[PDB]
Structures are given as C-alpha cells and as structure tokens.
Amino acid sequence: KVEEILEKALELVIPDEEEVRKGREAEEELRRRLDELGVEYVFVGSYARNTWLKGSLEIDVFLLFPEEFSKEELRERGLEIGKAVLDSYEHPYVHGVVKGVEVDVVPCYKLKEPKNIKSAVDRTPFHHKWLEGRIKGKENEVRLLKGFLKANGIYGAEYKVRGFSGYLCELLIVFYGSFLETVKNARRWTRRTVIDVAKGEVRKGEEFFVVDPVDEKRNVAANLSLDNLARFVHLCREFMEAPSLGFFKPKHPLEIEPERLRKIVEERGTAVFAVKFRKPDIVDDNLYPQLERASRKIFEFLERENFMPLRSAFKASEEFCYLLFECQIKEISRVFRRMGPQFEDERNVKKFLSRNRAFRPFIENGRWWAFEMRKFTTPEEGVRSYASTHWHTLGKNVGESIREYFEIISGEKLFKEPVTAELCEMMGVKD
Ligand SMILES: Nc1ncnc2c1ncn2[C@@H]1O[C@H](COP(=O)(O)OP(=O)(O)OP(=O)(O)O)[C@@H](O)[C@H]1O
Ligand SMILES: [Ca+2]
Ligand SMILES: [Ca+2]
Ligand SMILES: [Ca+2]
Ligand SMILES: [Mg+2]
C-alpha cells in the first residue's frame, strides 16, 4: 500500500503547470536584465534544483563580488532588476517580485572555493554546488519529505516553526536515497544522533547534528527543536505502521463553539487565562523567540508562586499577542509560611520577631517560621503583579509592549479572542 500512497502524495507535493509557468517566465526575464548589467550571478534556489514544494515558488539570485562593501552595488542591481523592491534584513538583501514571482537578490563573494567572510550568505553558493549534482532525479523524493513535514507543521527553520529547513530535507534525501528510506531510518533516530553526510555515516554525539558537507562544524539541523525532531520520528513510526495520504494533508482546525470550550475547561477544573498585549513591530524571527521567553518566565513565576502551571502557549495575530496559560490551582490560601532563622541566631531572631503579624510565628525543626499574607491568591492576580513590575524580563520588545499596556483575560471573553486553535491544542482537545 505504501508505494501507492506516495504516488497519490506526489499530486499534493508537485507544482501545477501554471505556477511552474510563473517560474520559467520570471527566471528567463530575470536573467535578461541581469545579463544586460553584465552581472555575475547564480540561482541558488530550491527553484534552481526543481526541488521546491507545490505552491511555494521563489527564486534566490546570488550576486558574486570580491572587496568589502557590496551593500549598495546590490541595492542597485536588485532595485534595477526587480519590478518591485522591498528590503529585508552583512545582512541587507533585496526582496522583490519579477514577472509575478518572489525574488531574493543577495550579494556574496564569488569565492575561490571555501573560506568565507563573516560566513553566512557566502556558504549558500557551495551548498548549491554540493546539492546540484547529487540531488538530480530525486527532486520529487524531496518534495515528498517537505510535503510530509509541511502537512504536520514542522517544515521550515524559521523560529516560528523550529522545524526542518529545506537544505536539511535535501541533505537527508541525498543521504538515504528517498523519502521512504528516510522515514524508515528516522524511526530509529535519537536526540544524540549525528548524521554526517560527507562521510556517509551515522554516529552518536551530544545532540541531533546533521553535519554540513561544506562545513563540518555547522549543524544544518540547528533550528530543529528537540520536540519537533521527536515529533518527526513519531510521525515516521506512525506512517510505516499504517501509511495514509492523510499524512500529506493539513489537519483541520477544531471547530469549537465557545460554550464547548467553557465546558471542557470547567470539566478540567483548571484556571485558563491569557495575557493580551500589542504586538510590537518586529520581524517573526525576533518576535517569536521573545514570545517563547516571555511565556517561559511567566510560567516559571507561576510555578514558584505555586499555582502549578500545566502548560503554556502563545499566539501572534496582526495586532495583538497572547500568552496562554492553564494552572491546576484556581485559588490559593491567603496565608503562607515565611521561613525564619535558626533558633540559635539570637539577632536575626529578634529581628524576625519584631515585625508585626496577624498571627504568632513558631518553631519547627529548630527554625523559626511565620504566617504571612500573600499579595494575591489567584494565578490571574499573580500574573498582573508580575507583568506589571517584571516586564523587563519578558524580552526587550514584548516586555516594552506589555509595559505600555496589557490585560489578563479569562472565561468566555478569552474564548472570543482568536486563540481557540492554540487553546485546544494546549489542552489536548480532540474532534
Ligand atoms: N543555502 C541554501 N541552500 C538551498 N537553498 C537555499 C539556500 N539559501 C537560500 N535558499 C532558498 O531557500 C528557499 C527554501 O528552500 P531550500 O533552498 O532550502 O530548498 P528546498 O526546501 O528543497 O525547497 P522548497 O523550500 O521550495 O521546498 C528556496 O527558494 C531556496 O532557493
Ligand atoms: Ca508554530
Ligand atoms: Ca509547531
Ligand atoms: Ca481574590
Ligand atoms: Mg529565499
């Protein structure tokens, strides 16, 4: 059955004649313009090796240069070849569109074989040279891997996904020969697994590490999060166990009427709430690490204060950001135990006892203790206190935003916000 599903899978991963139409057109036009400027360039794209996934067409033309400043000479070439130009972020490249297709124009050094400069963009040409001859013919094998990963939300190395980059996908296919062979062997992958392509071997190491043929110190799966690696391995065991075209299909968002969520949550008996604030104007690769950090800090705070957090999640929309939380403790006693000094310490004892308190401190196991009052008794109130005076620990941009404004939302109001998918996923809700 397997080989019959992978066959139907191809119709989901391979590009349709009208998009492979935009590709060829743009490429032809783009070279024309680039040749008229007499520029030294090379298509290093997934497009350049026909390995790009259905519906994800994009070109990456790298301009080759020596010297030091190629920031402006590129600004020129780019702005002069792209019908429309924008500028993403020694970093600055030109993202435009040409004949309707997204085009990245990056400047690098035509290098005399290895030993780059503040290496980063300069390796890309080599990555391309190393993959071009070895991946020929296995294009679709690659499109299967990616299509497989994308359907399960773990394709892409950007911080929002922390999954499998494309390069990685192609290295893996070169190493094993085919999608199927990849999944079959991926079932035995561990967190200490090292896939060294250059030496055609697999050994044990400190962490999952796919060595880059071009640079043996660079881990091509650096951004792949442990959990996503663990998710791929599991998906692989699950696919072999019972292959199905549904693995190459995107899962459908849980349609949840706000009243069925309130039911699940009262049934779980937990405290569900979110921290809402204005999304700062920063790029995803900057925002996401901050949203993860913030979510972690507030979670650790919740642990410390004993509200026993179960799990957290975050969500970024167009205007706002939410840090979702679920704690097992909805309310905690006002009173708590303050550890005092050892009965021996005559001074720290006189000091500890001079403070006025509603109740009398006591000795337990040779040490003084005192009952005091918390300044909050619910995880929601605690977070309001924390987000109010410790916003500086939630990331430079997020923290700053939460400092200006934010609100703790729970109940139905929380359900009205666009965090349902995340909410459900966080609590492990099913169909
Ligand atoms: N070092 C690089 N190696 C390969 N592709 C690169 C590199 N740098 C930029 N790219 C581009 O990144 C985009 C993402 O895909 P990638 O190149 O990783 O190949 P892929 O994953 O096999 O193809 P696709 O991403 O379309 O599924 C493509 O447009 C590709 O040209
Ligand atoms: Ca994600
Ligand atoms: Ca994910
Ligand atoms: Ca209260
Ligand atoms: Mg690109």
Is the domain of 293 the same as that of 395? yes
Residue nearest to atom 8 of ligand 1 (CA): 124
CA 185 to ligand 1 centroid distance, Å: 24
CA 161 to ligand 2 centroid distance, Å: 5
Instruction: Tell me which of 253, 279, 304 is where a domain ends.
Output: 253
Instruction: Tell me which of 121, 137, 153 is where a domain ends.
Output: 137
Please indicate if the annotation marks 18 as binding a ligand. no
Please indicate if the annotation marks 60 as binding a ligand. yes
CA 120 to CA 303: how far, in whole Å? 40
Ligand nearest to the CA of 108: 1
Give the list of residues 6+ apart from residue 100 with CB closer than 8 angstroms, or none.
22, 25, 26
CA 318 to CA 287: how far, in whole Å? 12
CA 73 to ligand 2 centroid distance, Å: 36
7, two tokens: 């066959």
Phi then psi dihedrals of residue 275, to 5 deg:
-105, 120
CA 325 to CA 323: how far, in whole Å? 7
Is the domain of 266 the same as that of 384? yes
Q: In the chain, after which residues is the C-to-N distance over 2.5 Å, breaking the chain? A: 89
Resolution of the structure, angstroms: 2.7
Instruction: Tell me which of 120, 137, 154 is where a domain ends.
Output: 137
* CATH code, domain carrying 372: 3.30.70.1550
Is the domain of 264 the same as that of 305? yes
Please indicate if the annotation marks 104 as binding a ligand. yes
* CATH code, domain carrying 192: 1.10.1410.30
**104 Cα nearest atom in ligand 1:** 29
CA 79 to CA 68: how far, in whole Å? 20
Please indicate if the annotation marks 46 as binding a ligand. yes
Ligand nearest to the CA of 166: 1
Is the domain of 284 the same as that of 416? yes
* CATH code, domain carrying 116: 3.30.460.10
Residue nearest to atom 4 of ligand 1 (CA): 167
Residue nearest to atom 16 of ligand 1 (CA): 166
Please give the residue range of the domain that contains residue 105.
Answer: 15-137
> For a pocket test of ligand 1, which of 12, 47, 52 has the largest count of ligand atoms closer than 8 A to its C-beta?
52
Is the domain of 119 the same as that of 176? no
Report angle CA 241, 242, 246 to the nearest 5 degrees: 135
Is the domain of 311 the same as that of 205? no
Is the domain of 178 the same as that of 274? no
Is the domain of 342 the same as that of 309? no
CB-based contact 251:355 (threshold 8 Å): no
- With tokens 């490429």, the residue in question is 27
Q: Which residues pair with 339 in a beta bridge?
A: 369
Number of domains forming the structure of the chain: 4
- Characterize the bridge pairing of strands 209-212 and 193-196: parallel
CA R_g for the chain: 27
> For a pocket test of ligand 1, which of 167, 169, 171 has the largest count of ligand atoms closer than 8 A to its C-beta?
167
**167 Cα nearest atom in ligand 1:** 18
CA 228 to ligand 5 centroid distance, Å: 22
Is the domain of 293 the same as that of 408? yes
Is the domain of 321 the same as that of 275? yes
- With tokens 């060829």, the residue in question is 24
Is the domain of 103 the same as that of 195? no
**53 Cα nearest atom in ligand 1:** 27
Residues with CB under 5 A from ligand 5 (ion): 60, 104
CB-based contact 427:268 (threshold 8 Å): yes
The CA distances from residue 216 to 195, 212, 226, 228, 366, in Å, are 11, 5, 21, 23, 59
Residue nearest to atom 26 of ligand 1 (CA): 52
* CATH code, domain carrying 417: 3.30.70.590
Is the domain of 271 the same as that of 235? no
Pocket of ligand 1 (CB under 6 A): 44-47, 51-53, 56, 58, 60, 124, 127-128, 142, 146, 165-167, 169-170
CA 408 to CA 375: how far, in whole Å? 17
Query: Sign of the CA dihedral 234, 236, 237, 238?
Result: positive
